[PDB]
Amino acid sequence: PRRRHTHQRGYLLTRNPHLNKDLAFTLEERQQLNIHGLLPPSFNSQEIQVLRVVKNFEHLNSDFDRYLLLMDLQDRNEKLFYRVLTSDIEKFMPIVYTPTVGLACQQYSLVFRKPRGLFITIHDRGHIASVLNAWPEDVIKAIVVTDGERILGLGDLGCNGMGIPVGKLALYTACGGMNPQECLPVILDVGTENEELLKDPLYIGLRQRRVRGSEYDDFLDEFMEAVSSKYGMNCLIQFEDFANVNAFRLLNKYRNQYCTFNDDIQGTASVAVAGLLAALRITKNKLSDQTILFQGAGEAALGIAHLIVMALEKEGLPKEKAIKKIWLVDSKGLIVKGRASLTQEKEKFAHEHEEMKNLEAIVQEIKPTALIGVAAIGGAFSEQILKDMAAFNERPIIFALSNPTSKAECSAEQCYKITKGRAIFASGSPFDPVTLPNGQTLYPGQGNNSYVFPGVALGVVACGLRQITDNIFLTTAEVIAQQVSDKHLEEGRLYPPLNTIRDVSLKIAEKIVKDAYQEKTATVYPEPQNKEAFVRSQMYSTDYDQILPDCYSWPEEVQKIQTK
Amino acid sequence: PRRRHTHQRGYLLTRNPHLNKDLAFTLEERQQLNIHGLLPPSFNSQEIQVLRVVKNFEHLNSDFDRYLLLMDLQDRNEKLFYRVLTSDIEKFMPIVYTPTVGLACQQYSLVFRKPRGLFITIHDRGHIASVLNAWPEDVIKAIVVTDGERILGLGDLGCNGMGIPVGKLALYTACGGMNPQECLPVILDVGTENEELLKDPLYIGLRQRRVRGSEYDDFLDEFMEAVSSKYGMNCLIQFEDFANVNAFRLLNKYRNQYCTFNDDIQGTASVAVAGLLAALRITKNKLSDQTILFQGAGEAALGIAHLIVMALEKEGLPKEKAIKKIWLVDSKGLIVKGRASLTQEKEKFAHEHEEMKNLEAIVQEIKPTALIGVAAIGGAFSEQILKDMAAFNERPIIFALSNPTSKAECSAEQCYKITKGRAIFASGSPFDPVTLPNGQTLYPGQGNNSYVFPGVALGVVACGLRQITDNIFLTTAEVIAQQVSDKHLEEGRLYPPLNTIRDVSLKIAEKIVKDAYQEKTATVYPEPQNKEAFVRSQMYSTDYDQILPDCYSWPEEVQKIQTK
Amino acid sequence: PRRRHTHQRGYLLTRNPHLNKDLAFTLEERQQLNIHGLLPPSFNSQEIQVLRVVKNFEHLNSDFDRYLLLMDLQDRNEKLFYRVLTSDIEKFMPIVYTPTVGLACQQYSLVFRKPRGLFITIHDRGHIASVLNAWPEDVIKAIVVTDGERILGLGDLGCNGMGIPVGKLALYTACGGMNPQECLPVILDVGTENEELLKDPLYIGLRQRRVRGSEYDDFLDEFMEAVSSKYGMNCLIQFEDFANVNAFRLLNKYRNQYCTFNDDIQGTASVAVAGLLAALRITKNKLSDQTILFQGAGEAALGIAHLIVMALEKEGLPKEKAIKKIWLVDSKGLIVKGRASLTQEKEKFAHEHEEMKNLEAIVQEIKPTALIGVAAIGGAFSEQILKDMAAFNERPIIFALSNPTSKAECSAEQCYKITKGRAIFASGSPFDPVTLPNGQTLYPGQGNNSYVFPGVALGVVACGLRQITDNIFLTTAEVIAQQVSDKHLEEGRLYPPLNTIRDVSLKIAEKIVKDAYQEKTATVYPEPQNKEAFVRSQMYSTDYDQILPDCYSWPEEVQKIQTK
Numbered sequence A, B, C: 001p002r003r004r005h006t007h008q009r010g011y012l013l014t015r016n017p018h019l020n021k022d023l024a025f026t027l028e029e030r031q032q033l034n035i036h037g038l039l040p041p042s043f044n045s046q047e048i049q050v051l052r053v054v055k056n057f058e059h060l061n062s063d064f065d066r067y068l069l070l071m072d073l074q075d076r077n078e079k080l081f082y083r084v085l086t087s088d089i090e091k092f093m094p095i096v097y098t099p100t101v102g103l104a105c106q107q108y109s110l111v112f113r114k115p116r117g118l119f120i121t122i123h124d125r126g127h128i129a130s131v132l133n134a135w136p137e138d139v140i141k142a143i144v145v146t147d148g149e150r151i152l153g154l155g156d157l158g159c160n161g162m163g164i165p166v167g168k169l170a171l172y173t174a175c176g177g178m179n180p181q182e183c184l185p186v187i188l189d190v191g192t193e194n195e196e197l198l199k200d201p202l203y204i205g206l207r208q209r210r211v212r213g214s215e216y217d218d219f220l221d222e223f224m225e226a227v228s229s230k231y232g233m234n235c236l237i238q239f240e241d242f243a244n245v246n247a248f249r250l251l252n253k254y255r256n257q258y259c260t261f262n263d264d265i266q267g268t269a270s271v272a273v274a275g276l277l278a279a280l281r282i283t284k285n286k287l288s289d290q291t292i293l294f295q296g297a298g299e300a301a302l303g304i305a306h307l308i309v310m311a312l313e314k315e316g317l318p319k320e321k322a323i324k325k326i327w328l329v330d331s332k333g334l335i336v337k338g339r340a341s342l343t344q345e346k347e348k349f350a351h352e353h354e355e356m357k358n359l360e361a362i363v364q365e366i367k368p369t370a371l372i373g374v375a376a377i378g379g380a381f382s383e384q385i386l387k388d389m390a391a392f393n394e395r396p397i398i399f400a401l402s403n404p405t406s407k408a409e410c411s412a413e414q415c416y417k418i419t420k421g422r423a424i425f426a427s428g429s430p431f432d433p434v435t436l437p438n439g440q441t442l443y444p445g446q447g448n449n450s451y452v453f454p455g456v457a458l459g460v461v462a463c464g465l466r467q468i469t470d471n472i473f474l475t476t477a478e479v480i481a482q483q484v485s486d487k488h489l490e491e492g493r494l495y496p497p498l499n500t501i502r503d504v505s506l507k508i509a510e511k512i513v514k515d516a517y518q519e520k521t522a523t524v525y526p527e528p529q530n531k532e533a534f535v536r537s538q539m540y541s542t543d544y545d546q547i548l549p550d551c552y553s554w555p556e557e558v559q560k561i562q563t564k
């Protein structure tokens, strides 16, 4: 076990969730820590503590009640919290993170009990350094920050968006083995445009409209200098759930000077491309053979498209040819050269072509090999679309990435039925196994951002990468695809099973670290002989640290009290 | 507003439920206490915090879940918790104490989250002093202690008994203004006979049978010494939920040397007598004039009868006259001279008489003016009993004290119906108002122990009474009955409204204090001018304290930084 | 030994002079306290520690430097400091207190290093309570307070007077076994009249003239309130080195409400009367037989005289007759009826007699059997006066109480020479033993206040006396006199030896405690069986406490970590 000799003693030690073991404290520990008597007189193994929590967990009636229970656990005993989470990652992920964390953010102001994370507001402009000073952990290696302007599919929840950094960093630890004590969740509160919350007597945020323009920009600037100043330039800064206009803009602004990335853009890209790469092992052809059609042309679609182009360039195809293989549809229709209401980023994919408004006709005209839904329009992949995709393609790739199930472009059932079982399918939300007439059962997987971010962070932090290139995300996509077995593919899965996420994260971190030492981008020296064991050594374990003083004798002659 | 200049700062301050205000911390408070940023950017008044708690409380689906919410609150923000309680004492008391705390204790080992109170076990024999060292508050004035052998009406729940001292002390504070910071809930774990808990892998207590005999006696001896030695002879020690045999033995053992009482014995006698005294103002005669028949002859019965005799003596009746006014019935029947299976204590009321077993006949024979049910046999005041009571008496006094209502000697509805509205009625457990055919509504009250202990503690402590005589309990009964208005009595109520209990507690303490100075038994000096103001000044307020450093300038001449 | 279980650990523990043992911490203590490595790797017994300190002490070149060394010691290791002191009380007393402390106070502003004691200024008026909150010890039982207006014979030293309360409390502990952690030295800074300090750039106090009048009076009132309110009414409050009018005035004002005394007045009275009482065992006659002449009629003379009168009334003489036995001489000369410049307090001894201004003739006129010098006029007991005293008395009682040596009414040498060895002599400042012409040596002792205050404080606090009557001082004088052996009296010693002082203090306290239970004035209950052992148990030892957690096992069955 890890040794960490605490100077804390008495009641206040029990109040630190990194020190507190509850009933797992032995008699010897309790007496030595001066807490003997503050706990009932029984001694639990971690397995006994897990049993208690699960029994409670099962007696609860909603996902929300389940979330509240686990969050109470997080704030009492960090190690037990992660022991529970990792005892069944597939069960607990959807409780502490999406989709449930969604309801928690809607209900954040109502249920606000024990705070988690650092709140920095626009009125602390010029004073961010001293806001940081309140955080009780000096050594921080990963930050997740939101301004709450675009939480999941729920829009502007302002300060209620604190649930996202908190639950995200939970997964950083549970999935990727980041040390939670080195993790810092942040919300930047500049106001909200959410009208209910402005009216709500219980709202915990700044009761004002969002501050915009160059004052916003200068506040974000200060946030970046203060954090990197205090925690070092190797501290990872991950943005989440910013508005569309800020997300790309800020990533572009900072990415070259700070150790930062944005999961809504780059993580989404990685995991989508990972699913494509896996699907290629079914179609048995190259990426350069594909024609990609995106329904949607937002953060998801443009991030994904950017990374596909990069994979195509890696395969040898020049950029301006790569781009021609990708078509976009937005709310105004197909993106083509000279259309009204194009942006500069949309314009890169504006190929010469007749304007088209209707998706079914777009499909019939473009005849994609791969059709990616990222528009949040439920049912968009209609019978005709699916019929057409199966007409044009042996094994049509169809990704219904919109979340949750209700917004999904089609179900697994509809996809497999209408394509007579030939579609290669993945989705944003889980769908049950589907059994086809011929008696095969298909297990369509989910392109979960959780395959990507935990291992990327671990990797980056472990070797001290100073910038996170888009190449890290391409390389990661390859690693993920690599973990899918032929048997998985023939089962219809494009992703490794969820329960292996801890292993996926390790392999992702391993590859990043090997690469950084290879190409001299690593900053942590001396270079480790064994990259595998080096990364493992940097992972947080759910086993309790020993915290007692190191006790040991000296030889009799020199240990004894001198008198005469 | 009260002061409290803490040295605590930063994260650990927020972990102290005595310092922590959560959102009620002003911006100046947060910045000054080095916690600015650990909380979301809104500043809430205490009422706004109350609304948040109450909205939460409301959406819960059981009293148990409501208990868990309030207990979580207690352990995060002690003032807010007490503000919640006192905002509707009649609504909250059944949730934090009886009957909900009963389920809490049953379930304590399953739902155990953060500890409250001090656990002292048989195996700490010889070390109790050092166990006391773990308690983080040095200044303790009130202790509630249990061995969990006889929790409410649920029997032996061993270490799970800890719910009782915690809930009991919450009522000390909420109902009587005892400072929670100065209160110590204690469980002595000597084992349990509870077979279910002994089998239960989750049980938090010692997994062994109860230690008996001298080993136990020596342990309690050391308990009393350690506690009074550390907290001083002025510190109140209240026994609760001991086995009846022990309860009486231990009170007898310690009452003359320590500041100790037993609420199951003495508080019960006090509140029953209080009801009787109130009833005398409807019957419009003397306690002297009554013939009392007790259904039951156990801890409740013998305690109440003892105090009745003392009230009779005080009226001017000699003991041996007093005594003949009280008859008891046990499981074997009427207590009569020379009957079998009698004890020394039941002997005091063994009058010369034919043995009888049937309560209806006993009733027809004794013809009491007052029938007091304390047998825990539901339905024992039958139709015939009620009929006879109302034929023998204009206004028959009928107390159905057995708890909960399902064990009550009769319901209020039956009592009022069969006595044709003539019975003066009180119960142990709440009954609904009853409306007579003449359109008058009667509101039978409850002889809630909560009318007695909060005020008695406040009194004993405020004036430094070294011992708690039985006369304290006679006095307290008189004070309670005196708070009942003629209007209340006309409404069938024998007790002051539960929502006034703060006031009732103050008046009880006023009287104890006034008495103590008068007959020179107080130990706090100098003697206060105005005894109401003095007691008032000893009571804990739910208002937040100010804990900011005291800041004030000096004249500039002597404040200047000297130079040369 | 004694146990004090601290939650302190690591560096800061070593900064607490009550926890810090330096090299006397064992290896196991160091490891357990998280300080192993902060000390060099040798383990010293207390005696080795004492040897180091004493070696340094003897290499220094002045008493002043010795003072600075021991004061540095007091501020790093309290137990070792007091071990050193007590190892040779006669040697160390004059270093930490008079006369060396006088130089310390004159130099206090220059040599100021680490603070000791609490500074409270007139500018803190209204805020005294909050000043008290800075003191890190909540349990306070003895306070010594000065305004620094009359320090020793060095007049007004303002804030530089802090040396007096500090040094005085050291003697409380060293001499009387008061717990130093329970003692609080205070200076009240209302300004100074000292022109050299007012002019000095380094002066540490308020650079202003003294606030007089009701502003002063109101300040002192708040002080008594705040201190009694925070520490309780049993907290001892000893006034020291106030101006003369203030001292009496303040003593009269508060003595009836507060547990307070003034050592300059009452301590002085007690020790001088102890000396007288001792001398009566040489002259083998009664106090009522004496004719007493005071050279001086200030604080010392009037307090001694008042206590003599009390002792005379105790022997059986009405006050009006006892008064006749005492003659005062002031700077205007013999005090008599009608005289100009008489305060109403001198009026108490203004007998019918003609004015006289020459001491020599006052002597030859009064023919006193005892002559007491408290006028601060060096050499006033001239050869002629001494010749007369020996002519008029077989054994003249002669007290040269003025301080220091240079202000003595006569030296031991001169007194013994001129009275040809028959004078019964004691002084305020120490003289060497004197070898007479017959070759016998006499050992005049010192009427040192140290004989009185440590034992008074011990007794008062031990039994919880709420006021300190003058009778305490009379009883105390008797006790000290009883400690002088006949053999000592034959050597010319009026006082028990300085190296037995702790025993004398024990005896003084025993008597106070016996008397207080005897006449029901004690407030600590229950009454101890054995008053001797009770006072002993209250005395601070110079032995180190054990501070390690109390560790002890439970039977293996219950101590076992529980699994499934």
Ligand SMILES: NC(=O)C1=CN([C@@H]2O[C@H](COP(=O)(O)OP(=O)(O)OC[C@H]3O[C@@H](n4cnc5c(N)ncnc54)[C@H](OP(=O)(O)O)[C@@H]3O)[C@@H](O)[C@H]2O)C=CC1
Binding pocket: A153, A244, A264, A268, A271, A295, A296, A297, A298, A299, A300, A301, A329, A330, A331, A332, A373, A374, A375, A376, A377, A401, A402, A403, A404, A407, A427, A428, A429, A447, A448, A449
């Ligand atoms: N790993 C995963 O499962 C992930 C899934 N997603 C899913 O992708 C979806 C979109 O996310 P994101 O890109 O961040 O959102 P954005 O809001 O950035 O983009 C939404 C895009 O949809 C376009 N659009 C809206 N209506 C239509 C329509 N009727 N037909 C065609 N296009 C339309 C918008 O058009 P315009 O440009 O005209 O406004 C915009 O281009 C969500 O459902 C989300 O759940 C996202 C990230 C990850």
Ligand SMILES: NC(=O)C1=CN([C@@H]2O[C@H](COP(=O)(O)OP(=O)(O)OC[C@H]3O[C@@H](n4cnc5c(N)ncnc54)[C@H](OP(=O)(O)O)[C@@H]3O)[C@@H](O)[C@H]2O)C=CC1
Binding pocket: B153, B244, B264, B268, B271, B295, B296, B297, B298, B299, B300, B301, B329, B330, B331, B332, B333, B373, B374, B375, B376, B377, B401, B402, B403, B404, B407, B427, B428, B429, B447, B448, B449
């Ligand atoms: N403030 C309140 O409202 C309070 C109410 N109570 C209630 O009073 C009831 C008794 O509690 P407590 O005195 O502590 O309990 P005990 O067990 O000490 O006393 C019970 C008594 O009932 C007797 N009894 C049992 N069966 C019968 C029967 N068929 N006929 C007559 N007597 C019978 C027992 O007889 P034997 O001695 O032969 O066994 C015993 O004397 C409980 O229901 C409790 O809820 C108690 C305290 C306070």
Ligand SMILES: NC(=O)C1=CN([C@@H]2O[C@H](COP(=O)(O)OP(=O)(O)OC[C@H]3O[C@@H](n4cnc5c(N)ncnc54)[C@H](OP(=O)(O)O)[C@@H]3O)[C@@H](O)[C@H]2O)C=CC1
Binding pocket: C153, C244, C264, C268, C271, C295, C296, C297, C298, C299, C300, C301, C329, C330, C331, C332, C333, C373, C374, C375, C376, C377, C401, C402, C403, C404, C407, C427, C428, C429, C447, C448, C449
């Ligand atoms: N235990 C001990 O050893 C103690 C010794 N002392 C010593 O006693 C001395 C006086 O102390 P204290 O009473 O506090 O001082 P005060 O200043 O209160 O008293 C001084 C007294 O001496 C008088 N005086 C001054 N000059 C003469 C003179 N020429 N002839 C006669 N009387 C004169 C003053 O007279 P007037 O009233 O006219 O001003 C005044 O009455 C100091 O030297 C002090 O060291 C004091 C306390 C304890």
Ligand SMILES: CCCc1nc2c(C)ccn(Cc3ccc4nc(-c5ccccc5-c5nnn[nH]5)sc4c3)c-2n1
Binding pocket: A244, A245, A248, A249, A265, A266, A269, A270, A297, A298, A299, A300, A302, A303, A306, A307, A343, A344, A345, A470, A473
């Ligand atoms: C791992 C691959 C990630 C990646 N690296 C990239 C580089 C270097 C360059 C370009 N992209 C594409 C990209 C990625 C995301 C994105 N969201 C946008 C957006 C979305 C909605 C609304 C407005 C805007 C908006 N419009 N204009 N500004 N903001 S536009 C946009 C472009 C990249 N993607």
Ligand SMILES: CCCc1nc2c(C)ccn(Cc3ccc4nc(-c5ccccc5-c5nnn[nH]5)sc4c3)c-2n1
Binding pocket: B244, B245, B248, B249, B265, B266, B269, B270, B298, B299, B300, B302, B303, B304, B306, B307, B343, B344, B345, B470, B473
């Ligand atoms: C406010 C007045 C309270 C009060 N002061 C009292 C004094 C001084 C003396 C006597 N009583 C009566 C009293 C009070 C309670 C009690 N429980 C008992 C008991 C209960 C159950 C089972 C066995 C026993 C049992 N049987 N024999 N021993 N234990 S017996 C018993 C007597 C008093 N009540």
Ligand SMILES: CCCc1nc2c(C)ccn(Cc3ccc4nc(-c5ccccc5-c5nnn[nH]5)sc4c3)c-2n1
Binding pocket: C244, C245, C248, C249, C265, C266, C269, C270, C297, C298, C299, C300, C302, C303, C304, C306, C307, C343, C345, C470, C473
């Ligand atoms: C153990 C005996 C204690 C004791 N109890 C006493 C009681 C109750 C009453 C009187 N004395 C005598 C006493 C004791 C000290 C003292 N200093 C004074 C003083 C000295 C110098 C200058 C002005 C004043 C001054 N003049 N007027 N006010 N201040 S006058 C004075 C009287 C007492 N001594």
Ligand SMILES: [Mn+2]
Binding pocket: A152, A240, A241, A264
């Ligand atoms: Mn997101």
Ligand SMILES: [Mn+2]
Binding pocket: B152, B240, B241, B264
């Ligand atoms: Mn009870």
Ligand SMILES: [Mn+2]
Binding pocket: C152, C240, C241, C264
């Ligand atoms: Mn002095």
